Amino acid sequence: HMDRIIEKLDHGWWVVSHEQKLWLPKGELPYGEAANFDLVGQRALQIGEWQGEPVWLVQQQRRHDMGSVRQVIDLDVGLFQLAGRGVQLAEFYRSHKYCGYCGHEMYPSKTEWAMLCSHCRERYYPQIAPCIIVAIRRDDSILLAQHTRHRNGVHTVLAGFVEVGETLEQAVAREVMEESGIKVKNLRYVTSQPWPFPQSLMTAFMAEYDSGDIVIDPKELLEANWYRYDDLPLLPPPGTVARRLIEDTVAMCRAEY
Amino acid sequence: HMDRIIEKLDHGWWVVSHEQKLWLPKGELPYGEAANFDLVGQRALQIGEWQGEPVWLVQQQRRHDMGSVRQVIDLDVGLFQLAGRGVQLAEFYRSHKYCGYCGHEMYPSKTEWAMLCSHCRERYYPQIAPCIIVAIRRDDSILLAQHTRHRNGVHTVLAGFVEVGETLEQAVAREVMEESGIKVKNLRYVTSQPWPFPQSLMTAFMAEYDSGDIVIDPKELLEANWYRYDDLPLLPPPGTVARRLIEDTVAMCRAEY
Ligand SMILES: [Zn+2]
Ligand SMILES: [Zn+2]
């Protein structure tokens, strides 16, 4: 897997990335012939395929329509994984322009997704951050929060990075306690999914309210409350782990009615 | 949390590390007054406490008794976590002597376990690699392998790094297939534990044999076979995730007898 100059008849999906953003003209991920996106002559890297068509990464700034890769979730959750990894790879290259061991310039491996040193023998691989995500059920109610980071009107479940020395279970209890001040029980693992940028592994849990009153960390959350399961506010998009977890909670509440 | 010169009456546990090894005179982790280990005047960093006593990291080479931090598992599994993190932290510093973004020298944060840049605003955090570990049951039998890496006579279960774009479940199936050529079913998550060096999060699964004949990747394993549950060879130490998983398998087989 090596980079190359785009030609006129090159076709596929174009992940055109600059400064942790990607280009989404008309709010869509560029699809089609390179010439229609003024991409001929640019250097691109194939980072995957989607529906038997290449996905290309290109590092270029555009004047308009640069945005976060989260916007792609709402387009297609599968393509989101490809596009975000593109964005992550550009950031991985940027954070390893110089060798942390010896200070010389690095260059990308051709046989792995790695950064190699022009001088020494060391190398770097992109990291995957373990993450928890948890839906907390209180009887016929579920805890949903609006996050400060997004400010997008979407009510969702709690999530955080696993810290050094912690199990997933300890990460769940800690994160919940920190963000909302509640204690949980009946922790149960339900599934996992990759998240592409920042590159992470989300482990999804279900849990029941144990004790405490909600007091939000304002650095993390704007609002948090218990919402009756059959009367929920605006939720994350269908197909996301967050949404699937909320809907399973709804399904279990339905089961006790 | 800042480093400092060891004085005569300093006391505690001494993680004395050089080149990914630590000092284990008489095969034990140094415990006691600094003066008894010729450590006075060395620069140390407190990385934790164990049984209300500080754990100190010191970067120094010793002539004898330098070894892998795995040796500490057999001493104490809890102290293992502290010591290995010490070793990991020394490696984290070494891999970030220079800034990957701009090439200038870095220096350790005093308020977080992070590396800060003398020139720019970027920073690095130690990574935690998500890992799977799986015990495969075939009826009254369990799959145990001897690994090429260790060559220590210990028969254990299968484990591997989660790769980009994979769920934990996909990582289990892939790793098993790759190392042993068997297909599994009834994947179930049982628990998680941190591993300190290389710093990782181990998610432990239980699984049942589905299909295939054992063909080992010699790069990974020396030997692999099915072992009757009540007649097992040499196992990993009590208290490890690997051991606990093997013993739960034994417990379930016992339950069907
Ligand atoms: Zn180098
Ligand atoms: Zn820098």
Short mmCIF file of C-alpha atoms and ligand atoms in Angstrom, two decimals:
data_model
loop_
_atom_site.label_atom_id
_atom_site.label_comp_id
_atom_site.label_asym_id
_atom_site.label_seq_id
_atom_site.Cartn_x
_atom_site.Cartn_y
_atom_site.Cartn_z
CA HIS A 1 0.00 0.00 0.00
CA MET A 2 1.72 3.16 -1.37
CA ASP A 3 0.63 6.68 -2.20
CA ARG A 4 0.20 7.96 -5.70
CA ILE A 5 -0.75 10.83 -7.94
CA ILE A 6 -4.46 10.87 -8.86
CA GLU A 7 -5.22 10.62 -12.63
CA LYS A 8 -8.27 11.89 -14.54
CA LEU A 9 -10.26 8.69 -14.63
CA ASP A 10 -9.64 7.81 -10.95
CA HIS A 11 -12.91 7.19 -9.21
CA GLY A 12 -14.16 6.29 -5.74
CA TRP A 13 -14.72 7.88 -2.38
CA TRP A 14 -12.56 10.85 -1.47
CA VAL A 15 -11.57 11.57 2.09
CA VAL A 16 -9.96 14.98 1.72
CA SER A 17 -8.62 15.92 5.09
CA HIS A 18 -6.88 18.94 6.70
CA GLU A 19 -6.43 19.84 10.42
CA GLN A 20 -8.61 16.97 11.80
CA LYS A 21 -11.51 17.86 9.45
CA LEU A 22 -12.70 16.43 6.16
CA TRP A 23 -14.28 17.95 3.08
CA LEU A 24 -18.05 17.43 2.76
CA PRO A 25 -19.35 19.54 -0.11
CA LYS A 26 -23.17 19.78 0.01
CA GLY A 27 -22.76 17.95 3.32
CA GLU A 28 -21.88 14.72 1.49
CA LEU A 29 -18.69 12.64 1.26
CA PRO A 30 -17.17 13.15 -2.24
CA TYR A 31 -18.00 10.27 -4.51
CA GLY A 32 -17.10 9.97 -8.21
CA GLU A 33 -14.37 10.78 -10.69
CA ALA A 34 -11.39 12.75 -9.36
CA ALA A 35 -11.81 15.33 -12.10
CA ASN A 36 -15.23 16.27 -10.76
CA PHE A 37 -13.68 17.18 -7.38
CA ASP A 38 -10.58 18.96 -8.78
CA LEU A 39 -8.42 16.21 -7.32
CA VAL A 40 -6.38 15.20 -10.41
CA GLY A 41 -2.63 15.54 -9.72
CA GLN A 42 -3.08 15.28 -5.94
CA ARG A 43 -1.30 12.58 -4.04
CA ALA A 44 -3.73 10.05 -2.56
CA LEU A 45 -3.53 6.89 -0.47
CA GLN A 46 -6.00 4.04 -0.70
CA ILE A 47 -7.25 3.33 2.85
CA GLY A 48 -10.01 0.84 2.01
CA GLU A 49 -12.92 -0.07 -0.24
CA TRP A 50 -16.66 0.51 0.12
CA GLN A 51 -19.17 -1.38 -1.99
CA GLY A 52 -16.30 -2.56 -4.27
CA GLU A 53 -14.95 0.97 -4.88
CA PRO A 54 -11.72 2.43 -3.44
CA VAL A 55 -11.69 4.87 -0.57
CA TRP A 56 -8.87 7.40 -1.02
CA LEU A 57 -7.24 9.67 1.53
CA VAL A 58 -5.94 13.05 0.31
CA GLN A 59 -4.35 15.77 2.45
CA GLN A 60 -5.60 19.07 1.18
CA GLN A 61 -7.38 22.08 2.56
CA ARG A 62 -10.57 23.27 0.95
CA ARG A 63 -11.98 26.79 1.31
CA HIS A 64 -15.51 25.59 2.26
CA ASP A 65 -17.41 22.64 3.74
CA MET A 66 -14.64 21.30 6.01
CA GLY A 67 -16.09 19.55 9.03
CA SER A 68 -15.86 16.96 11.73
CA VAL A 69 -15.95 13.30 10.77
CA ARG A 70 -18.89 12.81 13.21
CA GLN A 71 -21.10 14.32 10.46
CA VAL A 72 -20.55 11.10 8.46
CA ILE A 73 -22.29 8.98 11.17
CA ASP A 74 -25.59 10.53 9.96
CA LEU A 75 -24.73 9.77 6.32
CA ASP A 76 -23.67 6.10 6.76
CA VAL A 77 -22.27 4.42 9.91
CA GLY A 78 -20.16 1.97 7.88
CA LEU A 79 -18.56 4.67 5.70
CA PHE A 80 -18.00 6.69 8.88
CA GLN A 81 -15.53 3.98 10.01
CA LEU A 82 -13.48 4.36 6.73
CA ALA A 83 -13.53 8.14 6.57
CA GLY A 84 -12.65 8.59 10.29
CA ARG A 85 -9.72 6.17 9.95
CA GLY A 86 -8.49 8.32 7.10
CA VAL A 87 -8.64 11.37 9.33
CA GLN A 88 -6.94 9.37 12.16
CA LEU A 89 -4.14 8.24 9.80
CA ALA A 90 -3.40 11.85 8.77
CA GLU A 91 -3.18 12.75 12.48
CA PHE A 92 -0.97 9.72 13.19
CA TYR A 93 1.44 10.90 10.48
CA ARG A 94 1.42 14.43 11.82
CA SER A 95 2.19 13.30 15.42
CA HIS A 96 5.15 11.19 14.12
CA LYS A 97 6.84 13.47 11.64
CA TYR A 98 9.96 13.16 13.92
CA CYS A 99 11.17 10.12 15.74
CA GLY A 100 10.44 10.32 19.50
CA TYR A 101 13.45 8.06 20.23
CA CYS A 102 16.20 9.83 18.24
CA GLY A 103 14.70 13.00 16.74
CA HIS A 104 15.22 12.19 13.02
CA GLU A 105 12.50 12.42 10.40
CA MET A 106 10.13 9.49 9.98
CA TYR A 107 8.40 8.06 6.94
CA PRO A 108 5.34 5.79 6.60
CA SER A 109 5.80 2.01 6.32
CA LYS A 110 4.72 0.55 2.95
CA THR A 111 3.79 -2.88 4.43
CA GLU A 112 1.96 -1.89 7.63
CA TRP A 113 0.16 1.08 9.06
CA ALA A 114 3.29 2.21 10.86
CA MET A 115 5.77 5.01 10.92
CA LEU A 116 9.48 4.06 10.39
CA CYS A 117 12.59 6.07 11.23
CA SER A 118 15.02 7.36 8.62
CA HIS A 119 17.87 6.87 11.13
CA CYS A 120 17.12 4.31 13.83
CA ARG A 121 15.35 0.97 14.05
CA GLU A 122 12.31 2.01 16.13
CA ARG A 123 8.77 2.35 14.82
CA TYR A 124 5.26 3.49 15.90
CA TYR A 125 1.78 2.04 15.38
CA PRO A 126 -1.53 3.92 15.65
CA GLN A 127 -3.10 3.31 19.08
CA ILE A 128 -6.57 2.16 19.92
CA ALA A 129 -7.97 3.72 23.08
CA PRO A 130 -10.24 1.42 25.15
CA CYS A 131 -13.45 3.24 26.01
CA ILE A 132 -16.62 2.41 27.98
CA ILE A 133 -20.19 3.33 27.09
CA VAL A 134 -23.06 2.65 29.46
CA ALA A 135 -26.85 2.81 29.44
CA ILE A 136 -28.22 3.17 33.01
CA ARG A 137 -31.77 1.99 33.65
CA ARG A 138 -33.75 3.15 36.67
CA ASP A 139 -36.99 1.14 36.66
CA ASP A 140 -39.00 2.53 33.70
CA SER A 141 -36.49 5.36 33.22
CA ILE A 142 -33.13 5.79 31.44
CA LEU A 143 -30.35 8.27 32.13
CA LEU A 144 -29.55 10.49 29.17
CA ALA A 145 -27.23 13.47 29.06
CA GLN A 146 -26.44 16.32 26.67
CA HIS A 147 -22.70 16.79 26.29
CA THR A 148 -20.79 20.09 26.40
CA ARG A 149 -18.44 18.91 23.64
CA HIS A 150 -21.12 18.50 20.99
CA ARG A 151 -23.93 20.95 21.97
CA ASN A 152 -26.01 19.23 19.21
CA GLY A 153 -29.33 18.79 21.08
CA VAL A 154 -28.86 15.01 21.19
CA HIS A 155 -29.58 13.15 24.42
CA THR A 156 -27.30 10.20 24.86
CA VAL A 157 -25.72 7.74 27.30
CA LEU A 158 -22.46 8.08 29.28
CA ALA A 159 -19.02 7.23 27.90
CA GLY A 160 -15.33 7.67 28.89
CA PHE A 161 -11.75 6.51 28.38
CA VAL A 162 -10.44 3.54 30.36
CA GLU A 163 -7.59 4.74 32.59
CA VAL A 164 -4.29 3.06 33.59
CA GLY A 165 -4.64 0.16 36.03
CA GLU A 166 -8.47 -0.10 35.62
CA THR A 167 -10.73 -2.94 34.55
CA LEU A 168 -13.63 -2.01 32.17
CA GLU A 169 -16.00 -2.45 35.12
CA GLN A 170 -13.99 -0.03 37.26
CA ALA A 171 -13.93 2.41 34.33
CA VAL A 172 -17.75 2.28 34.10
CA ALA A 173 -18.32 2.89 37.82
CA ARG A 174 -15.69 5.67 37.90
CA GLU A 175 -16.99 7.49 34.77
CA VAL A 176 -20.62 7.36 35.91
CA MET A 177 -19.73 8.58 39.38
CA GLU A 178 -17.54 11.38 38.00
CA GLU A 179 -19.96 12.72 35.36
CA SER A 180 -23.29 12.21 37.13
CA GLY A 181 -22.60 11.26 40.75
CA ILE A 182 -24.65 8.07 40.63
CA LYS A 183 -23.69 4.59 41.82
CA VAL A 184 -24.71 1.62 39.60
CA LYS A 185 -25.15 -2.16 39.93
CA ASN A 186 -25.82 -5.16 37.61
CA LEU A 187 -23.06 -4.15 35.25
CA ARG A 188 -23.29 -6.25 32.15
CA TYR A 189 -21.24 -6.28 29.02
CA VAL A 190 -23.35 -6.38 25.85
CA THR A 191 -21.08 -5.64 22.86
CA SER A 192 -18.10 -3.76 21.35
CA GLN A 193 -17.49 -1.54 18.32
CA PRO A 194 -14.51 0.41 16.98
CA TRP A 195 -14.69 4.21 16.87
CA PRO A 196 -12.44 5.65 14.14
CA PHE A 197 -11.29 9.19 15.30
CA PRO A 198 -9.94 9.41 17.91
CA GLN A 199 -9.33 5.72 17.20
CA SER A 200 -10.95 3.75 20.02
CA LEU A 201 -12.62 0.52 21.06
CA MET A 202 -16.01 1.06 22.70
CA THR A 203 -17.20 -1.57 25.12
CA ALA A 204 -20.90 -1.21 25.74
CA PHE A 205 -22.50 -1.99 29.07
CA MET A 206 -25.97 -2.09 30.55
CA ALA A 207 -26.45 -1.15 34.21
CA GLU A 208 -29.10 -0.42 36.82
CA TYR A 209 -29.39 2.58 39.14
CA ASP A 210 -28.10 1.83 42.66
CA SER A 211 -27.91 5.16 44.58
CA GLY A 212 -27.27 8.91 44.41
CA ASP A 213 -28.71 12.16 43.02
CA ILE A 214 -27.62 13.55 39.66
CA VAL A 215 -24.95 16.24 39.88
CA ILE A 216 -23.34 16.94 36.52
CA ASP A 217 -19.72 17.84 35.86
CA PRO A 218 -20.32 21.02 33.80
CA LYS A 219 -16.97 20.50 32.03
CA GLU A 220 -18.50 17.30 30.65
CA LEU A 221 -22.31 17.70 30.50
CA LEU A 222 -24.82 20.48 30.00
CA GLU A 223 -27.80 18.53 31.32
CA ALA A 224 -28.65 15.03 32.59
CA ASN A 225 -31.91 13.45 33.68
CA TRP A 226 -33.95 10.27 33.85
CA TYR A 227 -36.32 9.92 30.92
CA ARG A 228 -39.31 7.61 30.84
CA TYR A 229 -38.53 4.79 28.41
CA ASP A 230 -41.58 5.27 26.15
CA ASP A 231 -41.23 9.06 26.01
CA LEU A 232 -37.65 9.80 24.96
CA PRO A 233 -36.19 13.07 23.63
CA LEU A 234 -33.84 13.40 20.64
CA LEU A 235 -31.56 10.37 20.41
CA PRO A 236 -28.29 9.49 18.62
CA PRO A 237 -28.62 8.11 15.09
CA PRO A 238 -30.01 4.58 14.45
CA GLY A 239 -27.23 2.05 14.05
CA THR A 240 -24.87 3.63 16.64
CA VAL A 241 -23.83 1.74 19.73
CA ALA A 242 -25.31 4.54 21.86
CA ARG A 243 -28.66 4.22 20.10
CA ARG A 244 -28.71 0.42 20.17
CA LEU A 245 -28.05 0.50 23.91
CA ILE A 246 -30.86 2.93 24.57
CA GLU A 247 -33.23 0.82 22.42
CA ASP A 248 -32.36 -2.45 24.25
CA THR A 249 -33.14 -0.71 27.51
CA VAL A 250 -36.49 0.33 26.03
CA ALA A 251 -37.01 -3.27 24.92
CA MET A 252 -36.44 -4.64 28.44
CA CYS A 253 -38.75 -2.05 29.99
CA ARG A 254 -41.35 -3.10 27.42
CA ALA A 255 -40.83 -6.68 28.58
CA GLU A 256 -41.85 -5.60 32.14
CA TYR A 257 -45.23 -4.08 31.13
CA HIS B 1 4.24 14.08 41.34
CA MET B 2 7.93 15.03 40.76
CA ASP B 3 11.22 13.18 40.80
CA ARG B 4 13.77 13.50 43.53
CA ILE B 5 17.10 12.44 44.91
CA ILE B 6 16.89 9.43 47.25
CA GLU B 7 18.14 10.04 50.84
CA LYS B 8 19.55 7.53 53.34
CA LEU B 9 16.40 6.83 55.29
CA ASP B 10 14.17 6.49 52.19
CA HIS B 11 12.31 3.22 52.30
CA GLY B 12 9.83 1.28 50.18
CA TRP B 13 9.72 -0.81 47.06
CA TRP B 14 12.35 -0.15 44.42
CA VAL B 15 11.65 -0.64 40.75
CA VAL B 16 15.12 -0.20 39.29
CA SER B 17 14.76 -0.40 35.56
CA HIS B 18 17.07 -0.35 32.49
CA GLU B 19 16.37 -1.43 28.87
CA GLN B 20 12.86 -2.89 29.54
CA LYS B 21 14.14 -5.00 32.47
CA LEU B 22 14.06 -4.54 36.22
CA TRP B 23 16.45 -5.44 39.01
CA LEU B 24 15.47 -8.52 41.05
CA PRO B 25 18.34 -9.45 43.35
CA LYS B 26 17.84 -12.96 44.78
CA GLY B 27 14.88 -13.06 42.40
CA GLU B 28 12.94 -10.64 44.61
CA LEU B 29 11.73 -7.06 44.12
CA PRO B 30 13.93 -4.75 46.28
CA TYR B 31 12.18 -3.81 49.48
CA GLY B 32 13.63 -1.73 52.33
CA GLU B 33 15.88 1.23 53.01
CA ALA B 34 17.58 2.81 49.99
CA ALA B 35 20.96 2.48 51.67
CA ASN B 36 20.65 -1.30 51.67
CA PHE B 37 20.29 -1.30 47.86
CA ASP B 38 23.00 1.33 47.17
CA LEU B 39 20.31 3.67 45.90
CA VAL B 40 21.07 6.81 47.98
CA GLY B 41 21.73 9.81 45.70
CA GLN B 42 19.82 8.29 42.77
CA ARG B 43 16.91 10.14 41.27
CA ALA B 44 13.62 8.32 41.86
CA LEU B 45 9.96 8.85 41.02
CA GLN B 46 7.09 7.66 43.18
CA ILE B 47 4.75 5.64 40.92
CA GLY B 48 2.41 4.26 43.61
CA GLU B 49 2.05 2.69 47.04
CA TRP B 50 1.77 -0.94 48.12
CA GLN B 51 0.55 -1.88 51.58
CA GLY B 52 0.96 1.78 52.68
CA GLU B 53 4.59 2.03 51.49
CA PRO B 54 5.83 3.97 48.44
CA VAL B 55 6.79 2.28 45.21
CA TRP B 56 9.73 4.11 43.58
CA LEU B 57 10.94 4.01 40.00
CA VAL B 58 14.69 4.46 39.40
CA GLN B 59 16.48 4.30 36.05
CA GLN B 60 19.74 2.52 36.59
CA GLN B 61 21.52 -0.48 35.21
CA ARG B 62 22.72 -3.19 37.54
CA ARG B 63 25.45 -5.71 36.70
CA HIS B 64 23.38 -8.76 37.77
CA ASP B 65 19.80 -9.97 38.27
CA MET B 66 18.12 -7.79 35.61
CA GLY B 67 15.04 -9.49 34.22
CA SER B 68 11.63 -9.31 32.67
CA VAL B 69 8.76 -7.89 34.69
CA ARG B 70 6.79 -11.13 34.03
CA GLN B 71 8.92 -12.71 36.81
CA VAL B 72 6.99 -10.52 39.30
CA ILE B 73 3.66 -12.25 38.43
CA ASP B 74 4.98 -15.30 40.35
CA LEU B 75 6.00 -13.12 43.31
CA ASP B 76 2.72 -11.13 43.67
CA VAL B 77 0.14 -10.35 40.95
CA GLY B 78 -0.82 -7.02 42.56
CA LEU B 79 2.79 -5.78 42.87
CA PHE B 80 3.33 -6.96 39.29
CA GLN B 81 0.87 -4.24 38.15
CA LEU B 82 2.95 -1.49 39.94
CA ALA B 83 6.37 -2.71 38.88
CA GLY B 84 5.34 -3.27 35.22
CA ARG B 85 3.85 0.23 35.04
CA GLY B 86 7.17 1.54 36.25
CA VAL B 87 8.91 -0.29 33.45
CA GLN B 88 6.23 0.96 30.97
CA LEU B 89 6.70 4.58 32.14
CA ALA B 90 10.48 4.39 31.54
CA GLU B 91 9.75 3.11 28.02
CA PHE B 92 7.14 5.82 27.45
CA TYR B 93 9.75 8.45 28.35
CA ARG B 94 12.32 6.85 26.09
CA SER B 95 9.92 6.75 23.08
CA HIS B 96 9.10 10.49 23.61
CA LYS B 97 12.47 12.04 24.25
CA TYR B 98 11.77 14.19 21.11
CA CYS B 99 8.50 15.67 20.04
CA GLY B 100 6.96 13.75 17.09
CA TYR B 101 5.16 16.93 15.92
CA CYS B 102 8.05 19.44 15.88
CA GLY B 103 11.25 17.55 16.76
CA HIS B 104 12.20 19.48 19.95
CA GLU B 105 13.04 17.82 23.25
CA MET B 106 10.20 16.81 25.55
CA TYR B 107 9.92 16.70 29.32
CA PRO B 108 7.52 14.83 31.63
CA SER B 109 4.35 16.55 32.89
CA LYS B 110 4.29 17.15 36.67
CA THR B 111 0.46 16.96 36.91
CA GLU B 112 -0.34 13.99 34.66
CA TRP B 113 1.39 10.96 33.25
CA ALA B 114 2.17 12.81 30.04
CA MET B 115 5.07 14.07 28.03
CA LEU B 116 5.09 17.86 27.23
CA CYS B 117 7.05 19.70 24.55
CA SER B 118 9.72 22.28 25.32
CA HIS B 119 8.72 24.17 22.15
CA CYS B 120 5.17 23.47 20.99
CA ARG B 121 1.80 22.91 22.63
CA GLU B 122 1.32 19.20 21.82
CA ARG B 123 1.57 16.36 24.32
CA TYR B 124 1.52 12.52 24.52
CA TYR B 125 -0.15 10.06 26.90
CA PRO B 126 0.84 6.42 27.47
CA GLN B 127 -1.43 4.12 25.43
CA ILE B 128 -3.40 1.13 26.55
CA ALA B 129 -3.59 -1.64 23.96
CA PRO B 130 -6.91 -3.57 23.91
CA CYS B 131 -6.20 -7.29 23.96
CA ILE B 132 -8.32 -10.47 23.90
CA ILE B 133 -7.74 -13.66 25.87
CA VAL B 134 -9.85 -16.75 25.29
CA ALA B 135 -10.35 -20.17 26.86
CA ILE B 136 -11.77 -22.65 24.30
CA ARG B 137 -13.70 -25.64 25.64
CA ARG B 138 -14.29 -28.75 23.55
CA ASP B 139 -16.63 -30.97 25.57
CA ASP B 140 -14.49 -32.26 28.49
CA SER B 141 -11.34 -30.79 26.92
CA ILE B 142 -9.62 -27.37 26.86
CA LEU B 143 -7.23 -25.92 24.31
CA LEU B 144 -3.86 -24.98 25.76
CA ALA B 145 -0.76 -23.85 23.92
CA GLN B 146 2.91 -23.31 24.69
CA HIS B 147 4.14 -20.01 23.28
CA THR B 148 7.35 -19.42 21.33
CA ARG B 149 7.88 -16.06 23.05
CA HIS B 150 8.18 -17.46 26.56
CA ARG B 151 9.46 -21.07 26.13
CA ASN B 152 8.74 -21.47 29.90
CA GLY B 153 6.98 -24.89 29.86
CA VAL B 154 3.65 -23.27 30.78
CA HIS B 155 0.51 -24.35 28.95
CA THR B 156 -1.91 -21.50 28.56
CA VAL B 157 -4.86 -20.08 26.62
CA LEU B 158 -4.83 -17.93 23.45
CA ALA B 159 -4.41 -14.15 23.43
CA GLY B 160 -3.80 -11.33 20.89
CA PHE B 161 -4.00 -7.60 20.18
CA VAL B 162 -7.26 -6.11 18.90
CA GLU B 163 -6.65 -4.68 15.42
CA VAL B 164 -8.00 -1.52 13.72
CA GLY B 165 -11.66 -1.67 12.73
CA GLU B 166 -12.38 -4.86 14.78
CA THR B 167 -14.85 -5.61 17.56
CA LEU B 168 -13.51 -7.72 20.50
CA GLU B 169 -15.56 -10.64 19.15
CA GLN B 170 -13.96 -10.32 15.70
CA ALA B 171 -10.55 -10.12 17.38
CA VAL B 172 -11.22 -13.40 19.23
CA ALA B 173 -12.35 -15.31 16.12
CA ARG B 174 -9.46 -13.89 14.05
CA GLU B 175 -6.74 -14.63 16.67
CA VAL B 176 -7.96 -18.19 17.28
CA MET B 177 -8.19 -18.91 13.57
CA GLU B 178 -4.74 -17.43 12.92
CA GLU B 179 -2.84 -19.16 15.75
CA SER B 180 -4.62 -22.53 15.81
CA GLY B 181 -6.88 -22.77 12.76
CA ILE B 182 -10.02 -23.52 14.76
CA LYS B 183 -13.46 -21.92 14.46
CA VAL B 184 -15.34 -21.14 17.73
CA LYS B 185 -18.91 -20.41 18.85
CA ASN B 186 -20.72 -19.29 22.06
CA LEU B 187 -18.34 -16.41 22.57
CA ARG B 188 -18.94 -14.94 25.97
CA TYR B 189 -17.29 -12.10 27.76
CA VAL B 190 -16.40 -12.92 31.37
CA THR B 191 -14.08 -10.18 32.70
CA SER B 192 -11.26 -7.65 32.11
CA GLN B 193 -7.89 -6.86 33.71
CA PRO B 194 -5.08 -4.42 32.97
CA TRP B 195 -1.69 -5.78 31.92
CA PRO B 196 1.14 -3.36 32.81
CA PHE B 197 3.99 -3.86 30.21
CA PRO B 198 3.32 -3.57 27.35
CA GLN B 199 0.44 -1.60 28.88
CA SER B 200 -2.78 -3.31 27.81
CA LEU B 201 -6.39 -4.08 28.67
CA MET B 202 -7.18 -7.80 28.55
CA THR B 203 -10.75 -8.78 27.85
CA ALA B 204 -11.33 -12.39 28.76
CA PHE B 205 -13.70 -14.62 26.88
CA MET B 206 -15.02 -18.15 27.12
CA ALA B 207 -15.81 -20.06 23.92
CA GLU B 208 -16.73 -23.49 22.60
CA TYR B 209 -15.09 -25.47 19.79
CA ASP B 210 -17.03 -25.21 16.50
CA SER B 211 -14.84 -26.74 13.73
CA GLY B 212 -11.32 -27.34 12.40
CA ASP B 213 -8.09 -29.23 13.14
CA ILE B 214 -5.25 -27.63 15.07
CA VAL B 215 -2.49 -26.20 12.90
CA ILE B 216 -0.17 -23.91 14.83
CA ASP B 217 1.54 -20.77 13.58
CA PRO B 218 5.14 -21.68 14.56
CA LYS B 219 6.00 -17.97 14.81
CA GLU B 220 3.47 -17.84 17.65
CA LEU B 221 3.24 -21.31 19.26
CA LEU B 222 5.48 -24.29 19.85
CA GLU B 223 2.68 -26.73 20.62
CA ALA B 224 -1.11 -26.76 21.03
CA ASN B 225 -3.54 -29.49 22.00
CA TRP B 226 -6.80 -30.33 23.73
CA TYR B 227 -6.28 -31.39 27.33
CA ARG B 228 -8.81 -33.26 29.41
CA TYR B 229 -10.15 -30.87 32.04
CA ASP B 230 -9.30 -33.02 35.09
CA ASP B 231 -5.81 -33.89 33.84
CA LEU B 232 -4.08 -30.61 32.98
CA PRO B 233 -0.37 -29.95 32.44
CA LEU B 234 1.60 -27.01 33.88
CA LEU B 235 -0.60 -23.92 34.08
CA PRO B 236 -0.07 -20.15 34.49
CA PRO B 237 0.14 -18.86 38.06
CA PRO B 238 -2.97 -18.74 40.32
CA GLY B 239 -4.57 -15.32 40.31
CA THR B 240 -3.85 -14.56 36.60
CA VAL B 241 -6.67 -14.02 34.15
CA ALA B 242 -5.33 -16.93 32.08
CA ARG B 243 -5.45 -19.24 35.08
CA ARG B 244 -8.87 -18.08 36.27
CA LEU B 245 -10.26 -18.71 32.80
CA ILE B 246 -8.86 -22.22 32.65
CA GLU B 247 -10.25 -22.94 36.15
CA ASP B 248 -13.78 -21.70 35.29
CA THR B 249 -13.74 -24.00 32.29
CA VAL B 250 -12.76 -26.84 34.63
CA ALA B 251 -15.59 -25.78 36.94
CA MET B 252 -18.20 -25.96 34.16
CA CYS B 253 -16.95 -29.36 32.99
CA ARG B 254 -17.24 -30.50 36.61
CA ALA B 255 -20.83 -29.24 36.55
CA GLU B 256 -21.55 -31.65 33.62
CA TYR B 257 -20.35 -34.82 35.42
ZN ZN C 1 14.58 7.22 15.23
ZN ZN C 2 6.72 19.81 19.95
#
